[PDB]
């Protein structure tokens, strides 16, 4: 079998969107509040707030996402941003260091902090396990990008209204991912199944982080270290 032009054009714009919204130089991290080793929360909040802007930039370039109602776009971003951040962070996760390494040695986040960022190992332990399993999948650049787009266009998220239209977009992306692996990935006989199981892991990681984020935002001494965008996206306000 063979991929079509519509499916390869979806891949092209999707890979392009990721290259615009992900900076492998990590040079913008010097503009965040520095990390201190909840001393890591100021740097961690700036890091997440920055990444949320990338996810919004990546989302706006996914085919069909821009044509959804603004309410659907907000509901999708509010519930999937945390998962897409976890998904994209795999690009900096190192199996050798068991940590996220972003350019310099001051932007290397590795476990022991964890308690200095305001989170507990009930989120870190499953997340690191998630990150190493995703890293072992050796995803192609095309596959990593499709998984982020499939994750964002999930209709089963609280808030979405036009469920049918969003589902049709997601299935088109899933057929592309299935057709890409069969035709372009050698040994990808069961990769599509393992990739979809990662989405199920994300919902569990989403739930755990949201539980722990509630404890932060309920203490004003900690939530004042967050950014307005983080408070808007990870908030509970409803459109």
């Amino acid at each position: 079998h063979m991929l079509s032009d519509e499916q390869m054009q979806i891949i092209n714009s999707l890979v392009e969107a990721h290259h615009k919204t992900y900076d492998d130089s990590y040079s913008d991290f010097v503009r965040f509040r520095p990390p201190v080793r909840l001393s890591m929360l100021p740097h961690l909040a700036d890091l997440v707030s920055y990444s949320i802007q990338k996810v919004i930039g990546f989302a706006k370039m996914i085919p069909g996402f821009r044509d959804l109602t603004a309410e659907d776009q907000i509901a999708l971003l509010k519930s999937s941003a945390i998962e897409i951040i976890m998904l994209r962070s795999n690009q900096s996760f190192s199996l050798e260091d068991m940590s996220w390494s972003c350019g310099g040695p001051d932007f290397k986040y590795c476990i022991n902090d964890v308690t200095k960022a305001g989170h507990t190992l009930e989120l870190l332990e499953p997340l690191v396990k998630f990150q190493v399993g995703l890293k072992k999948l050796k995803l192609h650049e095309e596959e990593h990008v499709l998984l982020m787009a499939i994750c964002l266009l999930s209709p089963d998220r609280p808030g979405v209204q036009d469920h049918v239209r969003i589902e049709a977009l997601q299935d088109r992306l899933c057929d592309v991912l299935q057709a890409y692996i069969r035709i372009q990935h050698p040994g990808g006989r069961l990769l599509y199944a393992k990739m979809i199981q990662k989405l199920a892991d994300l919902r569990s990681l989403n739930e755990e982080h949201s539980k722990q984020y509630r404890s932060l935002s309920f203490q004003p001494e900690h939530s004042m270290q967050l950014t307005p965008l983080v408070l808007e996206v990870f908030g509970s306000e409803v459109s």
């Binding site: 802007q53 919004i56 706006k60 776009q73 907000i74 509010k78 965008l229 808007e232 996206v233 459109s239």
Partner: peptide, 10 residues
């Protein structure tokens, strides 16, 4: 409402 989200989405 979602002031920053609306702006960021143009």
């Amino acid at each position: 409402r979602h002031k920053i989200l609306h702006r960021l989405l143009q």
